Amino acid sequence: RFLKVKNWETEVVLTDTLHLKSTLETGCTEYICMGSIMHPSVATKDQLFPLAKEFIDQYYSSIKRFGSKAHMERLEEVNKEIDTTSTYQLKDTELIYGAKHAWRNASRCVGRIQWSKLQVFDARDCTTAHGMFNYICNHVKYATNKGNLRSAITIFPQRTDGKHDFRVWNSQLIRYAGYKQPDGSTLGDPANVQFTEICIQQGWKPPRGRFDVLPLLLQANGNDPELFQIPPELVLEVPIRHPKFEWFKDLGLKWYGLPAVSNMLLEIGGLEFSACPFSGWYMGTEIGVRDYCDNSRYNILEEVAKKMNLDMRKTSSLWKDQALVEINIAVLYSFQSDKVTIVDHHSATESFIKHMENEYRCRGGCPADWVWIVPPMSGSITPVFHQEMLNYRLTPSFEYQPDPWNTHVWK
């Protein structure tokens, strides 16, 4: 079959053939859609062959060598390893290709126009937390690049029995701590209070401040995780100020310039890389709307609207909306002023529509999660809002996994 999707702002129509190559569940059934559910629901020898063959098949097809001598030998070599070792090892080329295509296949990611420019750091030779610490430090120094950020991933040893997992317990490489006070209130980032407790428990001496960079809590080979403090010179940070409101700096906000997911799982050929931190650069609304203005986060909306002499009696005065825009002007202006790479939601979506059209043209489609692609503010005035999108799961993929503190058995 073919499938059509339509832009209702422009009437452009694209024809998705690539969905015929989708695999694991969307979660949706023939009669129920779950597109708004965030989390819907080790491989044995038999289970691993078809996966390995499919990915090797797709890699050799991507390099115009399908059915070739080097293709058929690779397959046989992988088949050998899974009999010998119940698993197999990716070549370097397959690891780079796998990582890039897992980003390419990230339905929820609006930045995928950059997918082919990923720096892949092979860390599969790593054995200890300290070594992970060295890889991530280098990852951050590279990615940050004095403000001119560069996409990168670092991939650590794949799963084995599941009893020897590598994990970055941090959900992002750079995050700020949260501290719950005895009086209910929260100092710092409420999102990270639980993780802040875990670190404190593991010996972290916290500065109990408002923007404390958290420590890396790194697990290697299934051992208890260990604490490392990122060197402060490596953590690029941007004080937030406003181009019109001089009082804005008096909020004393800042944010880190380098966004980096670390809690996720990278599947390639049926091999699971449970520690694969990846970084890019920020869309302004991630900080400006969600990090600062979510009620379960830094929640400076009332603060910012208070200083904007806004009527906060009636919601219909739209103070929340007014204050949300200004905060997002400031976020953008601040990164741009300090020449730290950032992208506004308009430019990012405009670029995602181009990328999506190009991906239908050369690839047969582009899986896309409209619920995640549409920015969290000003939705309808961005072009993705009027763009129909099909959601399927292509592999290689990034996958969610359980939090390590829910699984790990301490020793």
Ligand X SMILES: C[C@H](O)[C@H](O)[C@H]1CNc2nc(N)[nH]c(=O)c2N1
Ligand Y SMILES: Cc1cc(N)nc(CCCN(C)C)c1
Please give the DSSP secondary-structure letter assigned to residue 42.
-
For position 332 contacting ligand Y by CB under 6 A, the verdict is no
Distance CA(251)–CA(299), nearest Å, equals: 12
DSSP β-ladder status, 152-155 and 119-122: parallel
Find the helix or strand (DSSP H, E) in which 6 lies: strand 3-6
The single residue listed with the structure tokens 């950032």 is 342
Distance CA(257)–CA(332), nearest Å, equals: 11
CB of 349: closest distance to ligand HEM in angstroms? 10
DSSP string, 77-104: HHHHHHHHHSS----HHHHHHHHHHHHH
Any binding-site annotation on 371? yes
For position 283 contacting ligand Y by CB under 6 A, the verdict is yes
CB of 363: closest distance to a copy of itself in angstroms? 15
For position 269 contacting ligand Y by CB under 6 A, the verdict is no
Q: What's CA 356's distance to the chain center, in Å?
A: 19
CB nearer ligand HEM, residue 106 or residue 227: 106
Among residues 286, 293, 319, 326, the one annotated as catalytic is: 286
The mark string for 30-59 relative to a copy of itself (x by CB under 8 A, - otherwise) is xxxxxxxxx---------------------
CB nearer ligand X, residue 173 or residue 348: 348
Find the helix or strand (DSSP H, E) in which 154 lies: strand 152-155
Binders of ligand X in range 324-383 (CB under 6 A)? 371-372, 376
Among residues 109, 199, 276, 293, the one annotated as catalytic is: 109
124 near 387, Cβ under 8 Å? no
Distance CA(192)–CA(52), nearest Å, equals: 37
Among residues 103, 115, 281, 319, the one annotated as catalytic is: 281
- Mark whether 281 is an active-site residue: yes
272 near 158, Cβ under 8 Å? yes
Cis peptide leading into 396, omega within 30 of 0?
yes
Distance CA(180)–CA(400), nearest Å, equals: 27
- Mark whether 112 is an active-site residue: yes
Q: Which stretch binds ligand Y (CB under 6 A): 82-90, 243-251, 277-285, 302-310?
A: 277-285
| Burial letters 377-393, b for 16+ CB under 10 A, else e | bbeeebbbbbbebbbbe
3 near 16, Cβ under 8 Å? yes
**The tokens of 67 are what?**
């059915």
Number of residues that bind ligand X (CB under 6 A): 10
User: Given the rule CB under 6 A, which residues bind ligand HEM?
Assistant: 103, 106, 108-111, 114, 118, 151, 153, 261, 278, 280-281, 283, 286, 290, 343, 348, 372, 398
Any binding-site annotation on 400? yes
Written as one letter, the residue type at 61 is: S
The mark string for 329-368 relative to a copy of itself (x by CB under 8 A, - otherwise) is x--xx--x-------x-xx--x------------------
| Among 160, 375, 372, residue whose Cα is nearest residue 271 | 160
177 near 368, Cβ under 8 Å? no
Q: From the list 211, 370, 401, 405, which residue makes contact with a copy of itself (rule: CB under 8 A)?
A: 370
Partnered with residue 13 across adjacent β-strands are 6
Q: Is 122 left (phi over 0), alpha (psi -120 to 50) or beta?
A: beta
Q: Which stretch binds ligand Y (CB under 6 A): 16-24, 217-225, 273-281, 389-397?
A: 273-281
- Mark whether 104 is an active-site residue: no
Q: Which stretch binds Zn ion (CB under 5 A): 33-41, 44-52, 222-230, 231-239?
A: 33-41
Among residues 74, 104, 112, 159, the one annotated as catalytic is: 112
- Mark whether 361 is an active-site residue: no
Binders of a copy of itself in range 253-292 (CB under 8 A)? 284, 289-290
Binders of ligand X in range 34-53 (CB under 6 A)? 36, 38
Which positions are annotated as active-site residues? 109, 112, 281, 286
Binding-site residues for L-arginine sit at 172, 281-282, 286
Which residues of this protein are in contact with ligand Y, per CB under 6 A? 111, 172, 259, 261, 278-283, 286
Which residues of this protein are in contact with a copy of itself, per CB under 8 A? 3, 5-6, 8-10, 19, 22-38, 284, 289-290, 293-296, 301, 315-318, 320-322, 324-326, 328-329, 332-333, 336, 344, 346-347, 350, 370-371, 374-381, 385, 387-393
Binding-site residues sit at 36, 109, 172, 281-282, 286, 371-372, 385, 400
